[PDB]
């Protein structure tokens, strides 16, 4: 147990840019040892609401694989991201499943994702015909036919663009300030669980 092959947890967190909430990024981590301590190396106020597992007893037990997803959302949306809660972003973008066993880390990023004129690099979906199944990716940019009459691919009355951008400015309050969220979802399969945590002495 030389403790040498650490997991690449820096790329997920220490990233210059984060993917939009409507099109999030998925990365798999395997064949390494976790270093959850680094989790509290930074950020002033960073919640760790681990549902389904003991928040402080995760190092000891070994897991088959871990999945990492990340995005950027508003203030109340970090509350809306809790499993089982119903919300427009919740039922239109991510839709965490009810039987979820993983942690959710949400931290303020006003210093790193706010523009004086107003940022336009972040988009989020407004409305969809049907709700999303858990762990589903939607990147469709087609027009929306709210009514029965076809839109024929042109905007106007009863035909709206599905994606609306945010506007992050420093003058806004805490509720409208940007927040970065990363979710870790653990899994257990027939594999020999090569994601064993650190061992001491």
């Amino acid at each position, epitope marked *: 147990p030389n403790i040498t092959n650490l997991c690449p947890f820096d790329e997920v967190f220490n990233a*210059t*840019r984060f993917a939009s909430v409507y099109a999030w990024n998925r990365k798999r981590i395997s064949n390494c040892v976790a270093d959850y301590s680094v989790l509290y190396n930074l950020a002033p106020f960073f919640t760790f609401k681990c549902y389904g597992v003991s928040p402080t007893k995760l190092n000891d037990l070994c897991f088959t694989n871990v999945y990492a997803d990340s995005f950027v959302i508003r203030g109340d949306e970090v509350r809306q991201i809790a499993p089982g809660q119903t919300g427009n972003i919740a039922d239109y973008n991510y839709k965490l499943p009810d039987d979820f066993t993983g942690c959710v880390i949400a931290w303020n990023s006003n210093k*790193l994702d706010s523009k*004086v*004129s107003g940022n*336009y*690099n972040y988009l989020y979906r407004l409305f969809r015909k049907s709700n999303l199944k858990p762990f589903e990716r939607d990147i469709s940019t087609e027009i929306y036919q709210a009514g029965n009459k076809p839109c024929n691919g042109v905007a106007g009355f009863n035909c709206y663009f599905p994606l609306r951008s945010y506007s992050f400015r420093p003058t806004y309050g805490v509720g409208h300030q940007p927040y970065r969220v990363v979710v870790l979802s653990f899994e257990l399969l027939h594999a020999p669980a090569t994601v064993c945590g650190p061992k001491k002495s």
Partner: antibody
Amino acid sequence: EVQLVESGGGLVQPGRSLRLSCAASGFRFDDYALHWVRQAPEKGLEWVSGISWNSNNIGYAESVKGRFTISRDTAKKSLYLQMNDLRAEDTALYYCVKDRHYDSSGYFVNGFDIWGQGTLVTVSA
Amino acid sequence: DIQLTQSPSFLSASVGDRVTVTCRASQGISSYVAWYQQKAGKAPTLLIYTASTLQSGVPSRFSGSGSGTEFTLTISSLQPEDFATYYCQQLHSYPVTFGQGTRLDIER
């Protein structure tokens, strides 16, 4: 190591177009923003052009607006500055500088990090 | 655009002295400013951004402060390597423009 190489400079008669090329080494080309900044001899510095990550936010200085064009290619990691309607003000040394926050001014953290050696452009008949 | 002005243009200095340069704007640009040092015939290098946050590998003699429309840079101790030209850059609006520049001088 991070390095920037600029090419295409020299001497240009007025009324003749030119293209300046900038290549990068040692960092992710399509995740960082870049700027072109010119300097006249013993005249301090002056911003010329800037570009962003996905070609969404681009703007030119009003002094040279409408005569220069910036373009970026991540396939070969190149930045092109196309010149048009050159006048006596264009003779200068050009630096292809790299920004450290994927976007132009407005964010809390911003700064020109890596400055190339620049290329010399002279304009006369 | 935004106009930036530095009051003392030329400052003769010697080793171990204290030097302060002031760069001020017209409209309040919050704290989106930076300082650059250009050597003799060399590409300028960044020293400080946001007027308080040192970037990396910069000697501790360099320091800065600023609020509202005032921004002041200071060097605690001077070495022969520090004699160069100094520029201040604003970053509030998009049409970024630098200052007229300030160059330190030796003392005879």
